[PDB]
Design a protein around this nucleic acid. Sequence first.
DNA 1: GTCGGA
Length: 227
Amino acid sequence: CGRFAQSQTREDYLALLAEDIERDIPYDPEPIGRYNVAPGTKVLLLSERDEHLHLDPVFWGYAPGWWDKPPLINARVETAATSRMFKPLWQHGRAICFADGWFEWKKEGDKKQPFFIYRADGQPIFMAAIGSTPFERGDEAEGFLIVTAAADQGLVDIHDRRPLVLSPEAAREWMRQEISGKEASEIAASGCVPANQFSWHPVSRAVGNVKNQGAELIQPVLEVLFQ
DNA sequence: GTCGGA
């Protein structure tokens, strides 16, 4: 899960959470406007610190100094709480990345067709994230990862993994600093949105190229073509 | 100390 859309205003997404949250985040009513959010850019990320919600631009990717490979963009839910690498992020670095949906490229051999995946009920999504705190320091290499889960039901036909998408109520619990890593694992296991609540459709090849932009990137195309 | 198109 390496591309998604985050096009609406921050208040549009925060409106889905508990009522006393949209006020914690300062007012900025500009639509975020991003139909092609890619790794290695700064992405607005929601988290809680000192008992208050914050929305911070955080690098999408994780590469500490001892990691001499390209930054990771995902963390597997099955093992992240116990990983030597991710355990500290699971414990103290949990965060939420809201989106309109995400893109996955179905493969035949190495040829690909992008699909956009979204809530059938028309709502946005809250993706579970873990990252390096303090998030506000604008680090250029130790940022956040999107947690992944096994694809289920019809999503298996597009790809065998999916982002961990949490219900609004679960997303709020996930961000709390006062919960244990074990509680977080139970939130991830209890609050995940199931595959039957999503729909998807093929989109134009244009989105694969990070250069391309705009609302047309999430519009359906008629023909599926693996290229 | 691990998991995306071009």
